[PDB]
């Protein structure tokens, strides 16, 4: 609607729409690696991404997104913590105004620069709108940005970008291979949490790698230079669509390592 990331607008308002933004398991948090306990009853997540069909990028007004063909087993993310597959939806960024912020999630409150999610949805409930009603609906897979050398597996996004600039954009994007996202790592934490935008729902077993990607100051640049506005409204930047970390409560972080 209305919600968004300013002052007016921005997560400390969402409750007022979105009551559960106060609920028992929201997301973001903040990470204490010393308080995460390596849980050795978790699997090694499976990332199946050989057969992702992405379908085109979005200017939502709030991120960019990166669809895809969810309609049979293609991309799909099991093992970990998770029970059943679950497919890949889509995939977007959160990141900052300045390379100190722009993740979700923090780690001993470190900020990253910026934070991929893959959304992915439970099979067990046929469709991504009955998956946000459950507990265990959806899986996201969020791996953070810094700032160092390129990622040449994000270039084809990153390049793109200028045909979206504003909010309600579209552009086909077909061919597109999420494994180049992925860092050598798929050591994570993983906690049950919920959607970090509206509707907040509390359906999501998050899984953050360890390991975070490097991107270079171009590639983060672009991002900085898209709109929230439409084409035609004055122009704000789309910056610092961040919410920032959400009481923990009575919940556990664990680590698949160490
Ligand atoms: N971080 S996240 O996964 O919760 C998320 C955002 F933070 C976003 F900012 C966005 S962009 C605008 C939301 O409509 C997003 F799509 C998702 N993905 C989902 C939420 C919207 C509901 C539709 C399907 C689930 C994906
Ligand atoms: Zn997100």
């Given at each position: ?34 308080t ?20 085109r ?50 780690v ?10 893959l ?7 046929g469709?991504?709108?009955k ?40 552009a ?24 970090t935008t509206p509707?907040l729902?509390?359906?999501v ?54």
């Open positions: 609607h209305h919600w968004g990331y300013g002052k007016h607008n921005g997560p400390e308002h969402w409750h007022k729409d979105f009551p559960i933004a106060k609920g028992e398991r929201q997301s973001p948090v903040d990470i204490d690696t010393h995460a306990k390596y849980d050795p009853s978790l699997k090694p997540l499976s990332v199946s991404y050989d057969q992702a069909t992405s379908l990028i979005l200017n939502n007004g709030h991120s960019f997104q990166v669809e895809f063909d969810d309609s049979q087993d293609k991309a799909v993310l099991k093992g970990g913590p998770l029970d059943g597959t679950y497919r890949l939806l889509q995939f977007h960024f959160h990141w900052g105004s300045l390379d100190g912020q722009g993740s979700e999630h923090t001993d409150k470190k900020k990253y620069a910026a934070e991929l999610h959304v992915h949805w439970n099979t067990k409930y469709d991504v709108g998956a946000l009603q459950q507990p265990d609906g959806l899986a996201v897979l969020g791996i953070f940005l810094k700032v160092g050398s390129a990622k040449p597996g994000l270039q084809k996004v990153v390049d793109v970008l200028d045909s979206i600039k504003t909010k309600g954009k579209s086909d994007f077909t061919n597109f291979d999420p494994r180049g996202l992925l860092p050598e790592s798929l050591d994570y934490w993983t906690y049950p949490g919920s959607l509707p729902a509390e359906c077993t998050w899984i953050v790698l360890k390991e975070p990607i490097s991107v270079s100051s171009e590639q983060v640049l672009k991002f900085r230079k898209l709109n929230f506005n439409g084409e035609g409204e004055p122009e704000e930047l789309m910056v610092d669509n961040w919410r920032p970390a959400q009481p923990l409560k009575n919940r556990q972080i664990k680590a698949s390592f160490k």
